[PDB]
Amino acid sequence: EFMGEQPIFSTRAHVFQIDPNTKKNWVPTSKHAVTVSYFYDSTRNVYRIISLDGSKAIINSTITPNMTFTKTSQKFGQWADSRANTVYGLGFSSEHHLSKFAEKFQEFKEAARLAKEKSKMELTSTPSGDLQSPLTPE
């Protein structure tokens, strides 16, 4: 498992990607199966898909409400990440794991929507040739 802050959900998959600025389509990111996890980053108040290959992150995708995870072939699903400017693809060990991951994606999509809503102003009546505003913005 992991040390320190635990992820909410983890699975095993081969990782693939599409880079917009190369002519190739799908390319293998990992040679072998790696752990793929949904993680709540409390300081940033966002949910992230985190995948490590050895000591480095090969997936660091911040879930947004408008993201779409699509199942497109046997045991394989994909989502586009506009922020990372990359499409990620996951090859699973069974159809069960593919579908479970997809279900979780929608769960984290809703949570991300609520997180953004939660991410407080004080309204007031108007303060009861001189200037009353601050001299500088900051």
GROMACS .gro file of C-alpha atoms in nm:
model
  138
    1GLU     CA    1   0.000   0.000   0.000
    2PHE     CA    2   0.101   0.364   0.053
    3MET     CA    3   0.268   0.540   0.347
    4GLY     CA    4   0.127   0.860   0.500
    5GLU     CA    5  -0.193   1.007   0.356
    6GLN     CA    6  -0.408   0.725   0.219
    7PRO     CA    7  -0.576   0.747  -0.120
    8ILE     CA    8  -0.952   0.688  -0.136
    9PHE     CA    9  -0.950   0.428  -0.414
   10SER     CA   10  -0.669   0.243  -0.590
   11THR     CA   11  -0.654   0.003  -0.883
   12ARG     CA   12  -0.401  -0.165  -1.112
   13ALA     CA   13  -0.366  -0.075  -1.480
   14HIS     CA   14  -0.127  -0.032  -1.771
   15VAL     CA   15  -0.095   0.340  -1.841
   16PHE     CA   16  -0.111   0.490  -2.190
   17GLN     CA   17  -0.120   0.849  -2.318
   18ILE     CA   18  -0.182   1.069  -2.621
   19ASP     CA   19   0.035   1.380  -2.653
   20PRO     CA   20  -0.113   1.654  -2.874
   21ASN     CA   21   0.222   1.776  -3.013
   22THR     CA   22   0.344   1.440  -3.148
   23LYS     CA   23   0.204   1.261  -3.454
   24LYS     CA   24   0.175   0.921  -3.280
   25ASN     CA   25  -0.160   0.822  -3.125
   26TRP     CA   26  -0.168   0.600  -2.815
   27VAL     CA   27   0.174   0.543  -2.656
   28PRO     CA   28   0.263   0.328  -2.356
   29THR     CA   29   0.350   0.533  -2.048
   30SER     CA   30   0.428   0.234  -1.828
   31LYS     CA   31   0.580  -0.090  -1.957
   32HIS     CA   32   0.415  -0.284  -1.674
   33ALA     CA   33   0.101  -0.250  -1.463
   34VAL     CA   34   0.114   0.030  -1.206
   35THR     CA   35  -0.110   0.151  -0.922
   36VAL     CA   36  -0.363   0.419  -1.015
   37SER     CA   37  -0.531   0.609  -0.732
   38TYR     CA   38  -0.789   0.877  -0.660
   39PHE     CA   39  -0.646   1.118  -0.403
   40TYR     CA   40  -0.794   1.412  -0.212
   41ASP     CA   41  -0.537   1.691  -0.181
   42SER     CA   42  -0.665   1.878   0.125
   43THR     CA   43  -0.442   2.187   0.091
   44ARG     CA   44  -0.558   2.246  -0.268
   45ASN     CA   45  -0.911   2.117  -0.200
   46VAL     CA   46  -0.909   1.910  -0.520
   47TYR     CA   47  -0.929   1.544  -0.619
   48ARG     CA   48  -0.641   1.407  -0.825
   49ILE     CA   49  -0.577   1.089  -1.020
   50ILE     CA   50  -0.226   0.993  -0.911
   51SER     CA   51  -0.019   0.718  -1.071
   52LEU     CA   52   0.344   0.647  -0.983
   53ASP     CA   53   0.594   0.453  -1.192
   54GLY     CA   54   0.871   0.390  -0.940
   55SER     CA   55   0.933   0.720  -0.760
   56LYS     CA   56   0.794   0.956  -1.024
   57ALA     CA   57   0.435   1.051  -1.106
   58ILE     CA   58   0.328   0.945  -1.455
   59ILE     CA   59  -0.029   1.056  -1.393
   60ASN     CA   60  -0.110   1.378  -1.205
   61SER     CA   61  -0.460   1.468  -1.320
   62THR     CA   62  -0.685   1.712  -1.134
   63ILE     CA   63  -1.046   1.596  -1.162
   64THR     CA   64  -1.282   1.860  -1.298
   65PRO     CA   65  -1.662   1.845  -1.323
   66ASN     CA   66  -1.666   1.849  -1.704
   67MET     CA   67  -1.407   1.572  -1.747
   68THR     CA   68  -1.531   1.257  -1.921
   69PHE     CA   69  -1.409   0.901  -1.869
   70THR     CA   70  -1.510   0.683  -2.164
   71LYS     CA   71  -1.497   0.305  -2.192
   72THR     CA   72  -1.397   0.248  -2.555
   73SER     CA   73  -1.269  -0.110  -2.585
   74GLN     CA   74  -1.213  -0.432  -2.391
   75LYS     CA   75  -1.071  -0.346  -2.048
   76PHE     CA   76  -0.962   0.001  -2.166
   77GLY     CA   77  -1.088   0.349  -2.084
   78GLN     CA   78  -0.969   0.705  -2.138
   79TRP     CA   79  -1.012   1.067  -2.035
   80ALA     CA   80  -0.885   1.394  -2.181
   81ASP     CA   81  -0.707   1.634  -1.946
   82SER     CA   82  -0.712   1.989  -2.084
   83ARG     CA   83  -0.495   2.125  -1.801
   84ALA     CA   84  -0.226   1.861  -1.851
   85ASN     CA   85  -0.278   1.884  -2.229
   86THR     CA   86  -0.269   1.503  -2.245
   87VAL     CA   87  -0.516   1.219  -2.297
   88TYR     CA   88  -0.475   0.933  -2.048
   89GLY     CA   89  -0.571   0.572  -2.114
   90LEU     CA   90  -0.584   0.279  -1.871
   91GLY     CA   91  -0.568  -0.091  -1.958
   92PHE     CA   92  -0.726  -0.297  -1.679
   93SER     CA   93  -0.688  -0.663  -1.581
   94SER     CA   94  -1.063  -0.726  -1.612
   95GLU     CA   95  -1.387  -0.562  -1.725
   96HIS     CA   96  -1.491  -0.543  -1.358
   97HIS     CA   97  -1.195  -0.315  -1.276
   98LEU     CA   98  -1.258  -0.100  -1.584
   99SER     CA   99  -1.622  -0.045  -1.486
  100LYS     CA  100  -1.538   0.016  -1.120
  101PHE     CA  101  -1.284   0.282  -1.216
  102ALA     CA  102  -1.539   0.448  -1.446
  103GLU     CA  103  -1.800   0.450  -1.168
  104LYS     CA  104  -1.549   0.608  -0.929
  105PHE     CA  105  -1.465   0.872  -1.192
  106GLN     CA  106  -1.827   0.993  -1.190
  107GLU     CA  107  -1.826   0.986  -0.809
  108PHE     CA  108  -1.511   1.202  -0.800
  109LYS     CA  109  -1.656   1.428  -1.071
  110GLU     CA  110  -1.951   1.509  -0.844
  111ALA     CA  111  -1.719   1.556  -0.545
  112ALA     CA  112  -1.503   1.793  -0.752
  113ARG     CA  113  -1.815   1.994  -0.841
  114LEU     CA  114  -1.905   2.023  -0.472
  115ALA     CA  115  -1.542   2.101  -0.383
  116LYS     CA  116  -1.536   2.394  -0.628
  117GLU     CA  117  -1.863   2.527  -0.482
  118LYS     CA  118  -1.711   2.506  -0.133
  119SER     CA  119  -1.388   2.674  -0.251
  120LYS     CA  120  -1.717   3.353   0.197
  121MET     CA  121  -1.799   3.722   0.149
  122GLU     CA  122  -1.938   3.979   0.391
  123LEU     CA  123  -2.222   4.182   0.240
  124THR     CA  124  -2.293   4.525   0.388
  125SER     CA  125  -2.509   4.832   0.340
  126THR     CA  126  -2.320   5.123   0.186
  127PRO     CA  127  -2.079   5.286   0.431
  128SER     CA  128  -2.274   5.562   0.606
  129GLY     CA  129  -1.485   6.624  -0.219
  130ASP     CA  130  -1.256   6.402  -0.013
  131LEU     CA  131  -1.176   6.043  -0.108
  132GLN     CA  132  -1.289   5.751   0.110
  133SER     CA  133  -1.121   5.466  -0.080
  134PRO     CA  134  -0.777   5.317  -0.018
  135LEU     CA  135  -0.484   5.480  -0.198
  136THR     CA  136  -0.349   5.153  -0.341
  137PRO     CA  137  -0.496   4.815  -0.430
  138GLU     CA  138  -0.225   4.627  -0.239
   0.00000   0.00000   0.00000
